Design a protein around this ligand. Structure first.
Ligand SMILES: NC(=O)c1ccc[n+]([C@@H]2O[C@H](COP(=O)([O-])OP(=O)(O)OC[C@H]3O[C@@H](n4cnc5c(N)ncnc54)[C@H](O)[C@@H]3O)[C@@H](O)[C@H]2O)c1
Ligand SMILES: NC(=O)c1ccc[n+]([C@@H]2O[C@H](COP(=O)([O-])OP(=O)(O)OC[C@H]3O[C@@H](n4cnc5c(N)ncnc54)[C@H](O)[C@@H]3O)[C@@H](O)[C@H]2O)c1
Lengths: 460, 460
């Protein structure tokens, strides 16, 4: 069994093979598209309040399998078990939040046209094809699926090939909730199967969460097929610390921001840009706090980090570390693959990272922090924006005026001032530049895949 | 002077060559990209109220050359002079409308996050590349340029090669208004130049109004370069008349909707779908009302129709008519090229048009009406959605409940009930399916090319 024929699950903590699943054939793809078409046809006619109730049924079904879901996440991609439980809880609360606030976001919108002649309606678009990654096997799916389905659309998941056990579990949860299989479906399609579905008329639009290379390859096919796409393609988020900052809170938020999910977060704090006056105190405190993180078996709740999900990606990450050191960076912590059958990489800190270095120009999708010195606040802003990515950012300073001014000049989709960066249903999510385009969550995730339809009566 | 080397303007009323313009070279492309990046860098730092005032300056500069602009539009693409003056007036009013209402649409947006810790901000994205067509040489530019610039973005126009006289005049209007260097620019680029700019990092996003073939070609490039794009690619709008409709008003709106701008409108009434009970009366009234339209020299205000804009497109439209007649349709009016040096095509009506015929499946971008009989309202809805396009639609019926129900099932971005289909700053514009995606005008045209940015303080 090889990836050329099957999707393979391997426990990254032990290296043992878990499951295999062959790619969907031509009959599977045709059957999936037929049921998605029939499902949307009936789902688009349901009441908005009925769909809001079905969202609550999803949240109830998810909580009824919360531990079964979290264990599957931890087993397949190595997430610490309490972070997998938090992912389940966050995904279930998302169902309840959209159930309460979603309908009001989908109400018809009045216009300034006289005599109440014109309103704006949010109509369903069709079946949305979703390409999702492995770092949050449940949350990445629910973040789009919940608002997409509430808007009357269908959702067809093409999950990452190393988390198909999570994909089947999610499908079972939707089945438990009474969601018709044409409204929520899934396929184990290879890249050619995705290309075929993008060209198929039964797919209305596409959404992609993954690498820059995956978004560029899929975004070109969606544009060629005249399908709207939303791309969320990770980032290299800057974490700015000025001299007047709450240093202790900044270090806590820096450590959590970088090493959450063993570093494998799109909006993780990756480029730490510290003003020169406070850089020595920050660096020493950051290394001390990163060194206090326990790493090991993700089923053991005492471990803050588990193994990295993919063996090839740990090799890639370590190669990036070696290149950055060879270019002139200094190693302050970790920086070597752990011996054993597990895919473990320890918390790592690189200092003296200049903008020409690998760890500054590429996404470090693992437990490796890069620390860059800034001459002043203007240099820090320039350093923050000197990146191909632009998903999110953090600024730590007690001068809230300068913080508001820097936020307005940061080329990214989210700015956190003196706090922990995270995605939340109540705020928009998504970035600019090579991080992609399109916004998720809040009312943005509801409207991105809606036919915004003007209805105008008696225009005479 | 071959189109392979020059952009050529030809007066369609006479056939005389007006002007030539060589394609921009590599230097000209690089120059404009540099000035656009420099212009945006300074424009994004200005106050919103300053830019709103400059919008009022654009409207003043446009009205100051209103007759010069309208005569240029009529001369280069053949629009009747009164419709060209109306285009100028509608474009200037768009400047004042966004100047008044735009700033409020760009204010920070509150969230449900407790204690007012998180707001949504609408930041500029960058320089927007615009690919525009010849049917509304001014309005198509202003519909995007006014909101795009107001939100702090830059605007780089690649106009259609037969209306470069209009493009230069438009640039003179922005220069008269004092719009800075690089905020509004334009290039006489060929298709390779557009490809070069899409791949360039100084272009943040693309917008395209034109054919389906152009949108698929440009949209594929935008996705491959990870640039968001908005595509408005014309349509084959259905015009449904049920048995209980106000026949007199329906006929007036049908004629106005089809033969406006000599039929060269993306949201024109193209496929007339009439219930069998009223079909005979509607058809006879439509032929008689279309026959009362005067056609001739577009500088003469008595003429409701001018010549078609492009000689090759009249040849293609007539080929579409000949194919539809050969497929079984009946000719009720017009249906033959006018002899002479002008590019004149008379008002044309085709009856017995079935869904398998050319005039039903392709866009008839000229003064040719296609009439299809529907058995009942359910059949009319099926006939309306049986199309690759989906820009807009019209329903005429005194049963307003049935009209609203059909509007919810019409696969298009705009539905007009008992009125005249048109675009308006106060409502959304844009469609679905092969008509493209994304919305223009109102707050949609402002937000499509904004960096929607979450700003969240003290998330602890
Ligand atoms: N949160 C994120 O944005 C995120 C998540 C995981 C990985 N990544 C980035 O991607 C890197 C590699 O991890 P990865 O290999 O899993 O990313 P990936 O893009 O290759 O996998 C992401 C998803 O896209 C799909 N995909 C990839 N190429 C495709 C194609 N040509 N056609 C159709 N579908 C395609 C994959 O099957 C998967 O479902 C990581 O190191 C990280 O930099 C980002
Ligand atoms: N309002 C509209 O949506 C609209 C306007 C004009 C034409 N059309 C449709 O298109 C048909 C032909 O008219 P047209 O020739 O002007 O359409 P067109 O698409 O060829 O021209 C539209 C614009 O797109 C540009 N363009 C086209 N192909 C391109 C490419 N490969 N790369 C870069 N830029 C490209 C053109 O230069 C022009 O500026 C019409 O008969 C009608 O069906 C629609």
């Amino acid at each position: 069994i090889t990836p050329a024929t099957h999707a393979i699950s391997i426990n990254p903590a032990t290296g043992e093979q878990l499951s295999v699943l062959p790619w969907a054939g031509a009959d599977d793809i045709e059957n999936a598209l037929q049921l998605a078409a029939a499902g949307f046809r009936d789902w688009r006619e349901t009441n908005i309040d009925y769909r809001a109730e079905k969202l609550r049924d999803i949240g109830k079904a998810l909580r009824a399998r919360s531990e079964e879901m979290a264990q599957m996440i931890t087993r397949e991609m190595g997430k610490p078990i309490n972070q997998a439980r938090a992912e389940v809880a966050k995904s279930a609360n998302l169902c309840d939040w959209y159930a309460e606030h979603g309908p009001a976001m989908l109400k018809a919108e009045p216009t300034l046209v006289e005599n109440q002649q014109a309103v704006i309606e949010y109509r369903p678009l069709g079946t949305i094809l979703a390409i999702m990654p492995w770092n949050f096997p449940l949350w990445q799916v629910m973040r789009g699926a919940v608002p997409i389905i509430l808007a009357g659309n269908g959702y067809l998941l093409k999950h990452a090939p190393n988390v198909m056990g999570c994909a089947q579990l999610i499908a079972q949860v939707f089945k438990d909730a009474g969601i018709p299989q044409g409204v929520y479906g899934w396929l184990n399609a290879d890249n050619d199967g995705v290309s075929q579905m993008i060209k198929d008329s039964r797919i209305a639009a596409v959404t992609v969460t993954g690498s820059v290379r995956a978004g560029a390859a899929i975004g070109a096919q969606a544009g060629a097929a005249l399908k709207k796409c939303v791309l969320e393609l990770g980032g290299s988020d800057p974490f700015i610390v000025l001299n007047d900052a709450d240093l202790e809170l900044a270090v806590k938020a820096a450590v959590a921001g970088r090493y959450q999910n063993t570093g494998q977060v799109c909006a993780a704090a990756k480029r730490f840009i510290i003003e020169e006056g406070i850089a020595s105190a920050f660096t020493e405190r950051f290394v001390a706090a990163a060194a206090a993180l326990k790493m090991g078996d993700p089923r053991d709740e005492e471990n803050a980090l588990g193994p990295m999900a993919r063996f090839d990606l740990r090799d890639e990450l370590h190669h990036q570390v070696e290149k950055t050191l060879a270019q002139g960076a200094r190693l302050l912590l970790g920086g070597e693959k752990m011996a054993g059958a597990g895919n473990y990489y320890p918390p790592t800190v690189l200092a003296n990272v200049t903008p020409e270095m690998t760890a500054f120009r590429e996404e470090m999708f693992g437990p490796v922090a890069a620390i860059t010195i800034a001459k002043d606040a203007e240099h820090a802003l320039e350093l923050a924006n000197d990146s191909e990515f632009g998903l999110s950012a953090t600024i730590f300073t007690t001068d809230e005026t300068q913080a508001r001014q820097m936020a307005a000049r940061l080329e990214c989709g989210g700015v956190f001032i003196n706090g922990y960066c995270a995605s939340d249903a109540r705020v928009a999510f998504g970035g600019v530049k090579k991080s992609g385009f399109g916004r998720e969550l809040s009312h943005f995730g509801l409207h991105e895949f809606c036919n915004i339809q003007t209805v105008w009566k008696d225009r005479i």
